Amino acid sequence: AEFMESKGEREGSSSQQCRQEVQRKDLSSCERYLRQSSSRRSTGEEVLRMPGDENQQQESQQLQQCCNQVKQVRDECQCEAIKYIAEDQIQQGQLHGEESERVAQRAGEIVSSCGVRCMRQTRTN
Numbered sequence: 001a002e003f004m005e006s007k008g009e010r011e012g013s014s015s016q017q018c019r020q021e022v023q024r025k026d027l028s029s030c031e032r033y034l035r036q037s038s039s040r041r042s043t044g045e046e047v048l049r050m051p052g053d054e055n056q057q058q059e060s061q062q063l064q065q066c067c068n069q070v071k072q073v074r075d076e077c078q079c080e081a082i083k084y085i086a087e088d089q090i091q092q093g094q095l096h097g098e099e100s101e102r103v104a105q106r107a108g109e110i111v112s113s114c115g116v117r118c119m120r121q122t123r124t125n
Contacts (some may be wrong), residue, residue: 010125014077016081019084020078021077022081023085024049025073026077027066027073029065031110034106034110035089038062046062047061049064070115076124079117080115081118082107082111083118104119
């Protein structure tokens with residue numbers, strides 16, 4: 001009489017699965033630094049240096065967490081990573097009325113450090 005069928009549904013946001021690992025490694029603290037009160041301990045056995053091995057050679061173990069964080073960036077998720085962090089905290093945080101644009105320049109602070117992605121640079125892969 002008849003015979004037909006077919007299934008297959010999915011949903012995503014960023015590329016393949018950038019937003020995924022992005023919310024873990026890639027810009028996942030640079031904006032959190034300015035979002036929070038001040039950088040602090042976290043997950044990672046790579047935090048036993050004052051001057052910071054993998055970070056701008058200068059007393060700044062705070063932004064070192066962003067450099068070490070952006071050090072886990074892929075390449076094509078670097079920019080989209082900023083489109084995530086520099087936004088999720090905007091919707092989550094009190095970033096509304098006219099205090100959301102102040103966060104745009106703010107993230108730029110850590111960007112100029114070791115967060116140069118979509119807040120200064122562009123797609124590179």
